[PDB]
Curated annotation (Swiss-Prot), chain A:
Protein function: Attaches the virion to the cell membrane by interacting with host receptor, initiating the infection. The major receptor is host ACE2. When S2/S2' has been cleaved, binding to the receptor triggers direct fusion at the cell membrane. When S2/S2' has not been cleaved, binding to the receptor results in internalization of the virus by endocytosis using host TFRC and GRM2 and leading to fusion of the virion membrane with the host endosomal membrane. Alternatively, may use NRP1/NRP2 and integrin as entry receptors.
Full-protein interval shown: 196 to 243 of 1273
Complex formation: Binds to host ACE2. RBD also interacts with the N-linked glycan on 'Asn-90' of ACE2. Cleavage of S generates a polybasic C-terminal sequence on S1 that binds to host Neuropilin-1 (NRP1) and Neuropilin-2 (NRP2) receptors. Interacts with host integrin alpha-5/beta-1 (ITGA5:ITGB1) and with ACE2 in complex with integrin alpha-5/beta-1 (ITGA5:ITGB1). May interact via cytoplasmic c-terminus with M protein. May interact (via N-terminus) with host bilirubin and biliverdin, thereby preventing antibody binding to the SARS-CoV-2 spike NTD via an allosteric mechanism.
Result for mutant: residue 15 to V: In strain: Omicron/BA.2.75
Glycosylation sites (chain numbering): 39
Designated name of the protein: Spike protein S1
Effect of residue 18 to E: In strain: Omicron/XBB.1.5, Omicron/EG.5.1
Swiss-Prot record, chain C:
Species whose genome carries this gene: Severe acute respiratory syndrome coronavirus 2
Gene name of the record: S
Task of the protein: Attaches the virion to the cell membrane by interacting with host receptor, initiating the infection. The major receptor is host ACE2. When S2/S2' has been cleaved, binding to the receptor triggers direct fusion at the cell membrane. When S2/S2' has not been cleaved, binding to the receptor results in internalization of the virus by endocytosis using host TFRC and GRM2 and leading to fusion of the virion membrane with the host endosomal membrane. Alternatively, may use NRP1/NRP2 and integrin as entry receptors.
Protein name: Spike protein S1
Residues of the full protein shown: 99 to 146 of 1273
Assembly, per entry: Binds to host ACE2. RBD also interacts with the N-linked glycan on 'Asn-90' of ACE2. Cleavage of S generates a polybasic C-terminal sequence on S1 that binds to host Neuropilin-1 (NRP1) and Neuropilin-2 (NRP2) receptors. Interacts with host integrin alpha-5/beta-1 (ITGA5:ITGB1) and with ACE2 in complex with integrin alpha-5/beta-1 (ITGA5:ITGB1). May interact via cytoplasmic c-terminus with M protein. May interact (via N-terminus) with host bilirubin and biliverdin, thereby preventing antibody binding to the SARS-CoV-2 spike NTD via an allosteric mechanism.
Annotated glycosylation sites: 24
Length: 48, 49, 48
């Protein structure tokens, strides 16, 4: 969240792992940039 | 814009933020209408000293 | 597809604006408003 712009970068990769964050390297591509202009100090993820 | 925006009693439909705890960041926007504390006392409800 | 989105903001209870990002079953939706969010916010499914 930089100078009112909210910047999202992301990646997807296929895996076969049971209960850990996979050991390896790959970079995230810049996905979208959103001009939202609002203080963010906290966040909360939404589960199904 | 005086010929568009001005009105004889005053076009009071244009508002600015007079108070803020701290100065806002580049391209930040704040839509809170909440009461500012200038005193050392806490303040609650619609108004106070 | 259990993780579906995020809240970002500061007050999270409509005293200020906040950002919603959600991937619900038909579309992604992104929205910035004075939201009153839940204490335990989620999305939910009828199973089998
Ligand atoms: C964004 O919001 C946060 C939280 O409301 C602000 O930080 C607060 O600032 C006051 C004054 O320094 C402190 O008394 C609070 O404890 C702070 N809380 C937190 C979580 O930081 C922050 O200053 C705001 N940012 C901008 C740019 O307005
Ligand atoms: C996903 O959420 C969006 C809103 O975030 C829903 O879109 C609404 O759908 C109704 C019915 O077509 C419209 O009347 C509203 O105006 C729509 N609002 C928005 C913001 O899109 C959408 O229906 C949801 N999809 C599912 C499958 O639940």
């Amino acid at each position: 969240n930089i100078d009112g712009y909210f910047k999202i970068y992301s990646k997807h990769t296929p895996i076969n792992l049971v209960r850990d964050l996979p050991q390896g390297f790959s970079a995230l591509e810049p996905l979208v940039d959103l001009p939202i202009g609002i203080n963010i100090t906290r966040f909360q993820t939404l589960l199904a | 814009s005086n010929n568009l925006d001005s009105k004889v009693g005053g076009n009071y439909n244009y508002l600015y933020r007079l108070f803020r705890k701290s100065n806002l960041k580049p391209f930040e926007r704040d839509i809170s209408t909440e009461i500012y504390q200038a005193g050392s006392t806490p303040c609650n409800g619609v108004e106070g000293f | 597809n259990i993780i579906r989105g995020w809240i970002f903001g500061t007050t999270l209870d409509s005293k200020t604006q906040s950002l919603l990002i959600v991937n619900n079953a038909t579309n992604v939706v992104i929205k910035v408003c004075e939201f009153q969010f839940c204490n335990d916010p989620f999305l939910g499914v009828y199973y089998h």
